[PDB]
Amino acid sequence: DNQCTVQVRLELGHRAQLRKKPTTEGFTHDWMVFVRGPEQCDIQHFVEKVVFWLHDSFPKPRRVCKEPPYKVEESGYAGFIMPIEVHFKNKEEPRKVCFTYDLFLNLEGNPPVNHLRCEKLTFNNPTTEFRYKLLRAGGVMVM
């Protein structure tokens, strides 16, 4: 008599623009990648940390945000595939979800890049504890 499914939403995104002039290092672009909730949700209730796995070419390429904003700001010269791990305040499975984020840059004279990726997470029969956190964050029951 106690089955329940709770949906929460995540937004992954990034912005990238051509620097007026390259940096010293010949970095041509500024970019920013993030994880956030939709308007008026606090994903920090169920998200323990977000880990952004930058290209090997970056120093300390494992970037952790343990609280909002969940984001990395950098300059560089090339797009790459970025693993993003979102770790949950969950005692049981699933403990985290792993995205493969396409961090692409604007070439030539293309406008700046401003992309959003909307992810719907479905938790089947979460524990009492974690269920609270999902709801506190503005998660929704699906019966």
The yes or no reply on residue 106 touching ligand M7T (CB under 6 A) is no
Element (H, E) at 122: strand 113-124
Selected range binding ligand M7T among 35-43, 56-64, 94-102, 108-116, rule: CB under 6 A: 56-64
Provide the minimum distance between the beta carbon of 52 and ligand M7T in the complex, in angstroms, as a whole number: 13
Selected range binding ligand M7T among 33-41, 72-80, 91-99, 112-120, rule: CB under 6 A: 72-80
Under DSSP, the state recorded for 44 is G
Q: Which of 17, 51, 58, 85 binds ligand M7T (CB under 6 A)?
A: 58
Q: How many CB atoms are located within 10 Å of the residue 3 CB?
A: 7
The tokens describing 112, both together, are: 């700046």
Please tell me the distance from the alpha carbon of residue 90 to that of residue 133, in angstroms, as a whole number.
9
Beta strands at 47-53 and 29-36: parallel, antiparallel or unpaired:
unpaired
The yes or no reply on residue 23 touching ligand M7T (CB under 6 A) is no
The yes or no reply on residue 107 touching ligand M7T (CB under 6 A) is no
The yes or no reply on residue 55 touching ligand M7T (CB under 6 A) is yes
Say if CB 10 and CB 134 are below 8 A apart: no
Residues contributing to the site for ligand M7T (CB under 6 A):
27, 55, 57-59, 76-78, 80
